[PDB]
Every structure is written in C-alpha cells, then in structure tokens.
Amino acid sequence: WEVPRETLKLVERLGAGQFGEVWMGYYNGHTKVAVKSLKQGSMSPDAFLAEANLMKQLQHQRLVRLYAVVTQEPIYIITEYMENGSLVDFLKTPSGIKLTINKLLDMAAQIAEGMAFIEERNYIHRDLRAANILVSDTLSCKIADFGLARLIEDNEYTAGAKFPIKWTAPEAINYGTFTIKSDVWSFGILLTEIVTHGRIPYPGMTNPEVIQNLERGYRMVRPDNCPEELYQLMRLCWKERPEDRPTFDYLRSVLEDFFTA
C-alpha cells in the first residue's frame, strides 16, 4: 500500500478543512488520483491512518476504494479520482439536470447497495447525504467519508460540536443516538435530493424551524415530479420509531424494481 511520496504530483486543491486537504493529482504521471493529506496537529497521525485501515477492510463496488498511502508526515491517503465530483454538485450541472427518473432511481439503488453492505459489516455512516456521494464518469456511485463519532456524537468534545440537522434523525438530534436506523432516515432525505436534482431539503425552513416541526410529526412534502410510490418509500424511512424503518436491503430491493419498471 505504501508508495514513495515522489510518485505523487499534487495539482488542484479540491477540499480543505479542520483535519486537512483533498487534492487532485497524478500517480506515476499517468494515474489521476485524489489525495487526502493530514494537517499536522489536527489529529493523531494514527487516528488518521485508522480511516485507511477501515477502507482496506471495507472494500466494495459502491464504496470509495483505497489506492495507496504515504506514512510519513505529512501522511497521505490516496484514492482514484472520480471525475464528476459529488452527487449533489453533479445533479446541478447540465448533464445531471437532464437525467430521467429512471437513471436517478438506478443511482439511488447503488447507494442503497453500498449502505446494505455497510449495515452488513456492522458499521454506521453518521453523515449520509448527497455531498458525501461521489460520481464517476460512467455515472456509477460510491459512498464516501463516514462521519467521525468524535465530532458528531455525545461525549467530551462535542460537549459544543454538532451535525447536519436537515438529514439527522429525531432520536440522534435529541439523544445523540446514531444507529443504522438513523442512517436509514438520512437515506430518505438523500432520496429527495436526488429526485429534485440537488435541491436542499425542507425548502423554506431554517434548522431550528425543522426541529420544532419534527416534534409535531412534520415530514417533507412530496417533491413535484417525485413518483407517489417512491414518496411512500421515503415515508417509511422517516417513521417515528427507528425499529420501524426498513433495512437498506429492502430499500435496495425496492429501488431496483422501480427502475426495471
């Protein structure tokens, strides 16, 4: 997995943040890659490499696959470059805009397939949303960046760190209890993003507004142009009781059929 740092040529910053940056570059000149570098101090070089180790163990068709690493400060995590960036951005570009519900549902099914495997392996995402879904040149999707429990859950630190309100389940917002079921709720919201081609969820509301209404049992209205059948699948994702929400396997199962229809 190790590669001399010389085989990498950074070219364009893609993302920056608390723990480092993500750059687009080349490996041995010909291979286009995405490189994540750890910001010295931001976090243990060990906890940083944890993400890589998880990646090796969690390889799958619909998940971001590790390519290589550089284990000397500054540590790098390298993956292959996904040409169309993040799903949420892709859906607003001319190509993404013209996509028919069929192609959209297929993509939704791919994500559901990725989540089924994650559920299968006893893991949780914690920050499932279109911004963390990557799209390749042939429009196949892959799930990326699990949300760090350190910054999203209840503990010493967050005690005052927070999360993406509009995508988070009621139980997680209130009691900080994140399970695969809250990832399911989240999937429901991700579903609306896809069908609306990137529109922000709960149009017309602020985060504190969302929170208030959620208590009264409020749920997003079916988007114009969203099949009513698909809509009721979303409603299953937003059931009040977590244990009442469907599994990704079923979701994956049901999405694949709307698509062959």
Contact 68, 2 (CB under 8 A): yes
Q: Kindly identify the residues of this chain, within the stretch 44-83, that bind ligand 9NH according to CB under 6 A.
A: 51, 54-55, 58, 63-64, 77, 79, 81-82
- The single residue among 74, 85, 176, 227 that binds ligand 9NH, judged by CB under 6 A, is 85
Composition of the chain by helix, strand, coil, percent to 5: 45, 15, 40
**Smallest distance, Å, CB 143 to ligand 9NH?**
5
- Specify the 3-state DSSP secondary structure of 9: strand
Ligand-binding annotation for 212, yes or no, is no
Using CB under 6 A as the binding rule, whether residue 91 contacts ligand 9NH is answered as no
Query: In the Cβ-directed half-sphere of 206, how many Cα atoms lie within 13 Å?
Result: 2
Ligand-binding annotation for 18, yes or no, is yes
Q: Going by C-beta distance under 8 Å and a sequence separation of 6 or more, which residues neighbour residue 128? A: 115, 143, 167, 183, 186, 187, 190
Q: From CA 217, how far away is CA 213, in angstroms rounded?
A: 7
| 127 noted as active-site residue | yes
- What is the per-residue binding string for ligand 9NH in 4-43, x denoting contact by CB under 6 A? ----------xx------x-----------xxx-------
Using CB under 6 A as the binding rule, whether residue 145 contacts ligand 9NH is answered as yes
- 111: its two tokens: 């994500």
- The single residue among 128, 133, 134, 195 that binds ligand 9NH, judged by CB under 6 A, is 134
- The single residue among 8, 115, 141, 144 that binds ligand 9NH, judged by CB under 6 A, is 144
Using CB under 6 A as the binding rule, whether residue 180 contacts ligand 9NH is answered as no
In the chain, the amino acid numbered 126 is R
User: Where in the sequence numbering do the catalytic residues fall?
Assistant: 127
Residues that constitute the known binding site for ATP: 14-22, 36
